[PDB]
Design a protein around this ligand. Structure first.
Ligand code: CA
Ligand code: CL
Ligand code: CL
Ligand code: CL
Ligand code: CL
Ligand code: CL
Ligand code: CL
Lengths: 32, 32, 32
């Protein structure tokens, strides 16, 4: 899948799909 | 629900209910 | 169980068994 670790809500074609971290802080994993 | 992100054990009327972070370190989510 | 919070893959006799943190960054929990 194509995924991004996001500061913001998942993009329209994406779904919240797990957990990642940005600088050690929990963040949305967004996948399409 | 009423929840707090705790350094300590959940208070008496609270239950461990998920995961949060305090300054980027995993911590207890306590809810009542 | 005997567990370690690892930067690397779990050792041969170990299995990935949960999540821990090293300096506030998610890491493998490896247990045997
Ligand atoms: Ca963290
Ligand atoms: Cl983002
Ligand atoms: Cl988690
Ligand atoms: Cl507790
Ligand atoms: Cl290690
Ligand atoms: Cl492994
Ligand atoms: Cl791996």
């Amino acid at each position: 899948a194509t995924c991004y670790c996001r500061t913001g809500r998942c993009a329209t074609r994406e779904s919240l799909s797990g957990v990642c971290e940005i600088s050690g802080r929990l963040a949305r994993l967004c996948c399409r």
